[PDB]
């Protein structure tokens, strides 16, 4: 494992700023001094397949323009491409290309680290169980990770107990999990795009975080999975075409029929102005997760809008404004945006199918069509469900389809 001064850096400016010329290189490298090194686009720093390629241990390091290739795969010894120590405060990792079977950006104990504009192509042959994380963040306060492009890693952007950090505008393609959250209290993430992923957003046990403007295009079996999130904010997310599938490992989640949003034991959070489009399940509301502000979303094109296996009533409109539903066959007499009759998304026969899957054979029967009409005529047999007084008549998310 050589050092960065053992390379041939041509200095452009004498303020600890370096510039590596075009040409391939070899082996691991380690930063122990605050060197703001840049690189030409032909600086292919190609490791041999072992160790962390660019270890950083000094504060204020502006890594820029490198092109990393083929580092290690020992996930226990953390064979990363860019390892960043806790003493390496305010590191900038700008506009880099990475190709290797381990961790892309492993940081831990860091403050104000900036992982901006990188392209991290993970793997092609590994079974999405040893590919390593794209942008791993381990208990960092102050981080600023923006507009990267992670492809084919294992579980995308993993975040473990990191308090204050923004995730703005980064594209995540063909990975197991898109963005993983573990105990990340007071977080934030804006405008991210996740494509063709076995879970679009894993939000596990992290409170007080802001999930805003994010996009999920053609992901598998879990659009946004929220486990045990409290006092959060879900405003403007676009979850599109969550098809069925399986994660392949079944470690922390299970296989699903395709859910655009899965709320598991999340008590208080505001879920407004979202767009859940063309999935099998629009939103799954578990029995432990009640009394949270769910108002203003757009449940369009889903084969089943809400799954709520309970008998407790659940109003879905705060301040008198509800959600837009595509199958809402209602009218609007007084010309406001709201509908006039309330919308119950679930029947009693729509919850016998969840309790007993053998009722799917009886789903075309006239007696079931009688039983759908008996509930609309006799509301005593209607179990108290997941209704919303004043649902919306027009689409509120006219901008999220762009």
């Amino acid at each position: 494992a050589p050092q960065s001064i053992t390379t041939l850096p041509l200095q452009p400016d004498g303020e600890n700023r370096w510039r590596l010329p075009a040409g391939e290189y070899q082996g691991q490298f380690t930063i122990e001094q605050p060197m703001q090194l840049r690189c030409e686009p032909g600086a292919v720093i190609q490791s041999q397949g072992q160790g962390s390629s660019l270890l950083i241990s000094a504060p204020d390091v502006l890594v820029e323009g490198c092109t990393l290739y083929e580092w290690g795969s020992d996930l226990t010894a953390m064979d990363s491409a860019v390892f960043i120590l806790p003493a390496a405060e305010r590191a900038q990792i700008s506009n880099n290309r990475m190709r290797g079977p381990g961790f892309g950006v492993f940081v831990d104990g860091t403050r104000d680290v900036q992982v901006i504009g990188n392209e991290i192509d993970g793997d092609a042959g590994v079974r999405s169980q040893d590919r390593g994380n794209g942008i791993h963040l381990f208990a960092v306060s102050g981080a600023r990770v923006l507009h990267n492009h992670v492809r084919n890693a294992r579980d995308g952007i993993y975040i473990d107990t990191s308090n204050g950090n923004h995730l703005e505008g980064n594209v995540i393609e063909d990975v197991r999990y898109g963005v993983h959250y573990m105990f990340a209290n007071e977080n934030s993430l804006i405008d991210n795009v996740t494509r063709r992923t076995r879970t679009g957003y894993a939000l596990m046990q992290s409170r007080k975080l802001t999930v805003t403007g994010n996009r999920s295009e053609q992901d598998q079996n879990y659009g946004i999975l929220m486990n045990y999130i409290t006092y959060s904010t879900i405003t403007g997310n676009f979850v599109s075409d969550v098809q069925r599938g399986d994660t392949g490992g079944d470690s922390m989640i299970s296989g699903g029929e395709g859910k655009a949003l899965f709320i598991y034991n999340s008590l208080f959070n505001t879920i407004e102005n979202n767009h859940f489009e063309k999935s099998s399940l629009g939103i799954h509301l578990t029995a432990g997760s009640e009394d949270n502000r769910i108002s203003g979303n757009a449940f369009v094109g889903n084969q089943q809008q809400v799954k709520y296996v309970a008998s407790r009533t659940q109003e879905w409109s705060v301040d008198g404004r509800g959600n837009y539903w595509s199958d809402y066959l209602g009218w609007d007499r007084n010309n406001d945006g709201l509908g006039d009759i309330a919308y119950e998304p679930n029947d009693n026969v729509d919850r016998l199918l969840w309790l007993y899957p053998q009722v799917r054979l009886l789903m075309n029967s006239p007696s079931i069509e009688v039983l759908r009409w008996v509930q609309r005529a006799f509301p005593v047999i209607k179990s108290p469900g997941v209704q919303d007084s004043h649902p919306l008549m027009k689409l509120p998310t006219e901008k999220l389809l762009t």
Binding site: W331, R333, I341, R376
Partner: protein, 267 residues
């Protein structure tokens, strides 16, 4: 009086109809089952809107089972031409049939909503018996009036036809039109226009359907939500008070009985 002597027949002939006593006990075994399920689900505006929908499906059904063969069932039976050679009029053998079949519906709903009150006063402990008597007294003296509309509807379609097999086709046609087609024509007019056809005319179209005037009377105090009502939520936009809704139900009797008498006078 001659109007009671032919009412005493139909009171003793309708109660021997085995098809009546099946669907008048079915009205009793459902009004106990709704009021027991309405007590176990404790709510109050849902057990009123379901009972008013129960008597929408059955009190026109008992009325049209009774009186579809009142005029044409006597004409092809030979006993109508005989009855005009008795000291009677055509107005006395129709009003007598209306009194005679009307006391059956006054007894078919006193059995039905009568056991519904004892399945509430003996089930929910500590309920207000004054609030129970007023709401279910309003169910008794208005499901008769809904029954008397379809009783007077059946005299219109019996005097017009001349064969009882075609009267059963029309009695099934009037039961389908006023109960679950006019509620669906008004729904499909509201869905396909998105409530922008007429913002002032459409609540007044509830008065052209006596099952909807019946539902608007019993849902006067226990309004509650809107999705239990459905197309009956337009009655909140009706500026008429509750007393006028009684009079539009009585005007559906008297217009369709004078129509029933003017048809029968030129039989």
């Amino acid at each position: 009086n001659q109007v009671w002597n032919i009412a005493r027949k139909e009171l003793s002939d309708g109660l021997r109809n085995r098809w009546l006593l099946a669907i008048s006990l079915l009205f009793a075994v459902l009004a106990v089952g709704i009021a027991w399920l309405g007590a176990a689900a404790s709510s109050i505006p849902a057990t009123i809107a379901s009972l008013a929908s129960l008597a929408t499906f059955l009190m026109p059904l008992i009325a049209l089972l009774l009186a579809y063969d009142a005029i044409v069932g006597e004409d092809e039976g030979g006993t109508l031409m005989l009855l005009l050679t008795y000291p009677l009029g055509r107005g006395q053998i129709l009003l007598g049939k209306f009194v005679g079949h009307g006391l059956i519906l006054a007894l078919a709903v006193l059995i039905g909503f009568g056991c519904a009150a004892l399945a509430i006063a003996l089930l929910v402990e500590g309920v207000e018996l004054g609030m129970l008597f007023w709401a279910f007294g309003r169910f008794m003296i208005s499901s008769t009036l809904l029954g008397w509309v379809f009783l007077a509807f059946a005299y219109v379609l019996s005097g017009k036809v001349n064969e009882k097999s075609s009267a059963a086709g029309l009695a099934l046609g009037v039961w389908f039109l006023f109960v679950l087609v006019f509620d669906l024509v008004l729904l499909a007019l509201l869905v396909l226009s998105e409530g922008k056809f007429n913002p002032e005319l459409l609540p007044w179209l509830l008065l052209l359907n006596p099952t909807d005037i019946y539902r608007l009377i019993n849902l006067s105090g226990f309004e509650g939500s809107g999705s239990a009502m459905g197309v009956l939520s337009l009655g909140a936009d009706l500026p008429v008070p509750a007393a006028v809704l009684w009079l539009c139900l009585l005007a559906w009797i008297g217009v369709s009985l004078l129509l029933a008498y003017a048809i029968f006078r030129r039989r």
